[PDB]
């Protein structure tokens, strides 16, 4: 009782940090895999998805 | 008759009307611009002139 909202997320226990994935934002995000060249710092972030 | 141009004849005229600015043109309000660089070098369109 009092559960305000119930989402269906990717399972962090399966997609562990050992996978390189970070799911805290609600999407998988992997640093330094695909990554644009020729862009300002912090423009790399969307590619992490 | 119309007045003869001074340069037209060989007399020297030591009084003349001289156009002039009322005060110094260099007011020190020099032009300055916000240059803003392309976000991504690869995206730039060299093409079409």
Swiss-Prot record, chain A:
Coiled coil: none annotated. It is found in: Virion. Inner capsid protein that self-assembles to form an icosahedral capsid with a T=2 symmetry, which consists of 120 copies of VP2, with channels at each of its five-fold vertices. This capsid constitutes the innermost concentric layer of the viral mature particle. Homodecamer; each decamer is made up of two conformers of VP2, called VP2A and VP2B. 12 homodecamers assemble to form an icosahedral capsid. Belongs to the turreted BTV-fold inner capsid family. This is Inner capsid protein VP1. It comes from Bombyx mori cytoplasmic polyhedrosis virus (BmCPV). The chain holds residues 199 to 247 of 1333 of the full protein.
